[PDB]
């Protein structure tokens, strides 16, 4: 009953916090690039060097069908729509837990959660395609658990979505 409501509410709140720490620091990928195989930590909009003679010197970064994919990778509209969709879903579940008289808002919020998972999977697959589509000529493919808690956000969003669907079924049976 209300225990699952509390569970999905705290799951959504943890999803928002995990989302903002995902779209916060730029600790996404570790590569042996050049500030020589020097180790730098790369994110989305900025990349700096954690060791070497250029300590403290941080620089900005960027980037028919291939043009569309690289434009999507550079603009990163997929995470923007994902986080906007997640925030709208959170506002909808806040309204649902505030306004008990509304019926279709639970099904709507489940739809927003499933589409948030959809946005997450398309964003992660376009990110791997973008950063592996340039092989050029060892340990260049290293991960700093960023995609690991991205996967955690994905699975918790899927869990709260299926819980919302199940409780829509329950509340329609109770009607």
């Amino acid at each position: 009953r209300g225990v699952q409501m509390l569970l999905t509410t705290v799951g959504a709140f943890a999803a928002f916090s995990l989302m903002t720490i995902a779209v916060g620091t730029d600790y996404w990928l570790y590569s042996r690039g050049v500030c020589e195989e020097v180790m730098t930590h790369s994110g989305l909009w900025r990349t700096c060097c954690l060791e070497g003679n250029f300590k403290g010197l941080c620089k900005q970064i960027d980037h028919t069908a291939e043009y569309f994919l690289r434009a999507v990778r550079a603009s990163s509209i997929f995470p923007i729509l994902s986080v906007i969709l997640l925030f709208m879903g959170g506002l909808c579940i806040a309204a649902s837990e505030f306004y008990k008289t509304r019926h279709n808002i639970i099904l709507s919020a489940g739809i927003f959660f499933v589409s948030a998972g959809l946005s997450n999977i398309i964003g992660i697959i376009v990110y791997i395609s973008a950063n592996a589509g340039d092989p050029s000529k060892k340990n260049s493919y290293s991960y700093g658990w960023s995609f690991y808690f991205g996967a955690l956000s994905f699975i918790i969003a899927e869990m709260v979505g299926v819980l919302a669907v199940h409780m829509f079924i329950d509340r329609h049976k109770q009607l």
Binding site: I111, S129, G133, D134
Partner: protein, 375 residues
């Protein structure tokens, strides 16, 4: 006897031990060894000299003075020209030439053809488009005949069996083709492989500012070199290169880039240089030659002509070219092809199916929403 020689990369090198001796045995390569061979064939005391002009010899046609090795020969300062020089009509009434010992012509070289890394076309590489929308036609035919027989039975079992056998043959042919493609990893030469295949393509081509290439391209009546000239003139002003170093720096940058249109000497020299990345020769165009020169009224002209002709016929310059052009190389992969690591498939070769599946799921949930809305 004294002979002039210009400093060039296929022919004469400064020795690593510069302090070994100043004089005769101070340079190595094709040209000095050819000079030593013809000197041993004829019999004469020969030295090594360097022209202080730095040019190959062209008539300026305003002050009426000849420069370079041909100018040194004309102005009574040299008698032997072992340095290679292309035979031209203007440089025939002022200097007499021997028979050419090397055949060269305008050639094509292109950047290194690497493996393709597409996003969607990688999935499209096995089979072809025709087979695939014939699969679509077969699928819609199966759907419509199933809907026809719908309105346990023998017909259903037969249609299920033939559909299963059909998709079975499709998966087997697809898997066999993809396995062959991954096993052989055979590279395919680009479109720029012939004169015309270079003509209709969209790849920008570049050349030097002035020289034999520009002189040949000034006048043409073949109606294909006219098309090439119109393509060159209507392109960007970055086609013209002041020096070949800037041109090679341009062509090593992009896969298409500004491809050269030059003679084969630097092609065969650079196919086996220290950066073994480009080793492409394509086809051959035009016809030129390289020969030694001798001023008029000199009795050694006939002797050196017979010497170079005998040396070319019995064969000693071909041996020198093979030893110092193919055997002398930083890498051995150009002469004989090698293999490479197959490595992992990554995702860029299989990224096509992922997008199709996720878009299908998305369109399924939209059409489910539309079904809810309309009902």
């Amino acid at each position: 006897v004294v002979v002039t020689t210009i400093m060039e990369s296929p022919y004469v090198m400064y020795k690593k031990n510069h302090e070994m001796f100043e004089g005769n045995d101070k340079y190595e390569g094709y040209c000095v060894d050819l000079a030593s061979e013809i000197a041993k064939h004829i019999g004469i005391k020969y030295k090594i000299a360097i022209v202080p002009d730095g040019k190959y010899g062209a008539r300026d046609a305003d002050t009426k003075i000849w420069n370079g090795m041909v100018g040194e020969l004309v102005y009574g300062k040299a008698e032997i020209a072992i340095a290679p020089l292309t035979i031209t009509l203007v440089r025939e009434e002022v200097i007499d030439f021997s028979k050419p010992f090397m055949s060269l012509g305008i050639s094509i070289m292109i950047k290194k053809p690497q493996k393709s890394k597409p996003g969607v076309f990688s999935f499209l590489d096995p089979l072809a488009y025709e087979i695939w929308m014939c699969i679509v036609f077969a699928y819609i035919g199966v759907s419509v005949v199933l809907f026809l027989v719908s309105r346990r039975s023998l017909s259903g079992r037969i249609v299920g069996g033939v559909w299963w056998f059909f998709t079975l043959i499709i998966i087997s042919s697809y898997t066999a083709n993809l396995a062959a493609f991954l096993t052989v990893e055979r590279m395919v030469s680009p479109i720029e492989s012939a004169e015309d295949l270079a003509k209709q393509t969209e790849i920008a081509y570049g050349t030097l500012d002035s020289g034999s290439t520009k002189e040949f391209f000034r006048r043409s009546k073949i109606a294909v070199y006219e098309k090439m000239w119109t393509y060159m003139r209507s392109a960007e002003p970055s086609v013209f290169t002041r020096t070949t170093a800037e041109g090679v720096a341009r062509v090593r940058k992009s896969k298409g880039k500004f491809a050269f249109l030059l003679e084969s000497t630097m092609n065969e020299y650079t196919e086996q240089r220290k950066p073994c990345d480009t080793m492409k020769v394509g086809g051959n165009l035009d016809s030129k030659g390289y020969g030694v020169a001798t001023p008029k009224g000199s009795s050694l002209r006939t002797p050196v002509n017979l010497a170079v002709l005998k040396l070319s016929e019995a064969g000693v310059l071909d041996k020198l070219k093979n030893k110092w052009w193919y055997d002398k190389g930083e890498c051995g992969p150009k002469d004989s092809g090698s293999k490479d690591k197959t490595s992992a498939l990554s995702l860029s070769n299989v990224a096509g199916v992922f997008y199709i599946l996720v878009g299908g799921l998305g369109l399924a949930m939209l059409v489910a929403l539309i079904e809810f809305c309309y009902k």
